[PDB]
Design a protein around this ligand. Structure first.
Ligand SMILES: *[C@@H]1O[C@H](CO)[C@@H](O)[C@H](O)[C@H]1NC(C)=O
Ligand SMILES: [Fe+3]
Ligand SMILES: [Zn+2]
Lengths: 331, 109
């Protein structure tokens, strides 16, 4: 196995961008990156743990996952969102509803929900953490997926077990065996997909990140047609997300092994790839951009750079006391 | 469905698909222990090893060439040391050009 930095792609389209990243890094005399192909973040986590890959960008839900045994991976570099002059290392998980109705955060029982995917931050860990006191959940031998399936009348939760929990997959738009899939094959997957599940009239509430509604809808008059649910059981316009979110959580991060993780090499690659292929840096290639019809390949599209994670910080410390306690509490 | 063959046939892509095949093989070789696939595995693993050693060398040389060109680009200061650099840059480049051809060839094996 080569001594350079090997990146983990969770899908064919991701691999293609990653191939391009390699071609471009080599053309401009910078640090090399190659690509390893897997089908899910879990598989990428296992790959890095087992010394078949070195690096992948995970959502908070999977950073937590990758911190456990036998993996023990740590965040090495965080995504930086926002704008060059006002940069953010956190994001708000919100609940997005259609303007017109009058149901509040405490009146969600028997309504239809959209989620980014199972065990993700804004789409599962925050909403389900928030709603748990309504779910009437008993614990093992009952999985939490059952109580949620009783709670909402129907939902899309990509990656949910379709066998035992068909009611969490009902709402999904995937064709055949790609229904409820944890990938782009499912049109309602991730931030962008979950909002589409609401837009099409298929759902009633979308559990996503604060910036999604601004990314997908360019016209202000269209955005005036949507609202957020505040946890004080009030509705507010979408641009009032600071006063109306469900959690503030740290951004997605690249993870690597706790020991022999190639940490220096990864950061050297990311710093150097950012200066050469970050925001407005090059017409030839974009590290933080995806072709049409693809979303957030390798890194968040609206990401503007990276921020190094200080040495003595593991996954638990990265996610912060509040969210880290909350996940454990949810399980 | 659809695809462009030149993209799928470049060495970067062939190596990546090969290591995926190795992964799938030893995964379906776990699913079983809970034998002729082992011989198939052993070959792909051997073939993958040869393709990795070459790529690592291509990585190695690019860095070596990069440092040398910078050493050289500092040209004000003797002249024979300079030529010594020029010679070495050229040599490594001819080596790079052979190792990449060694790869394009090995990648159908
Ligand atoms: C949980 O209990 C409340 C109050 O008894 C009830 O209104 C609600 O229908 C229950 N929720 C579920 C999961 O059925
Ligand atoms: Fe997220
Ligand atoms: Zn073909």
């Amino acid at each position: 196995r080569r001594r350079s930095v090997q990146w983990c792609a969770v899908s064919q389209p991701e691999a293609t961008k990653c191939f391009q990243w390699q071609r471009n890094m080599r053309r401009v005399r910078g640090p090399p990156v190659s690509c390893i192909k897997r089908d899910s973040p879990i598989q990428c986590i296992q790959a890095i743990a087992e010394n078949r890959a070195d690096a992948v960008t995970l959502d908070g839900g999977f950073i937590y996952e990758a911190g456990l045994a036998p993996y023990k991976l740590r965040p090495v570099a965080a995504e930086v969102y926002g704008t060059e002059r006002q940069p953010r290392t956190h994001y708000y998980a919100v609940a997005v509803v259609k303007k017109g109705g009058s149901f509040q955060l405490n009146e969600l029982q028997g309504l239809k929900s959209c989620h980014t995917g199972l065990r993700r931050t804004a789409g599962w860990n925050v909403p389900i953490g928030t709603l748990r006191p309504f779910l009437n959940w008993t614990g093992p031998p009952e999985p939490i997926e059952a109580a949620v399936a009783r709670f909402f009348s129907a939902s899309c939760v990509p990656g949910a077990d379709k066998g035992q929990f068909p009611n969490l997959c009902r709402l999904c738009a995937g064709t055949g065996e790609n229904k409820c899939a944890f990938s782009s094959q499912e049109p309602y997957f991730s931030y962008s997909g979950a909002f589409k599940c609401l837009r099409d009239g298929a759902g009633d509430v979308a559990f996503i990140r604060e910036s999604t509604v601004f990314e997908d809808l360019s016209d202000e008059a269209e955005r005036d047609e949507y609202e957020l649910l505040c946890p004080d059981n009030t509705r507010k316009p979408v641009d009032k997300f600071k006063d109306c979110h469900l959690a503030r959580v740290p951004s997605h991060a690249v993870v690597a092994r706790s020991v022999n993780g190639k940490e220096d090499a990864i950061w050297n690659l990311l710093r150097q790839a950012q200066e050469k292929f970050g925001k407005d840096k090059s017409p030839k290639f974009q590290l933080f951009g995806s072709p049409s019809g693809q979303k957030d390949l390798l890194f968040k599209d609206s990401a503007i750079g990276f921020s190094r994670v200080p040495p003595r910080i593991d996954s638990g410390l990265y996610l912060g006391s509040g969210y880290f306690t909350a996940i454990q509490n949810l399980r | 469905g659809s695809h462009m063959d030149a993209e799928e046939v470049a060495p970067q892509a062939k190596i990546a698909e090969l290591e995926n095949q190795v992964h799938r093989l030893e995964q379906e070789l776990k699913e079983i222990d809970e034998a002729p696939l082992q011989s198939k595995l052993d070959a792909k693993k051997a073939k993958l090893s040869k393709l990795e050693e070459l790529s690592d060398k291509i990585d190695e040389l690019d860095a070596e060439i990069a440092k040398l060109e910078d050493q050289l680009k500092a040209a004000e200061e003797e002249d024979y040391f300079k030529e010594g650099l020029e010679k070495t840059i050229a040599a490594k480049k001819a080596e790079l050009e052979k190792t990449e051809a060694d790869l394009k060839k090995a990648v159908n094996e």
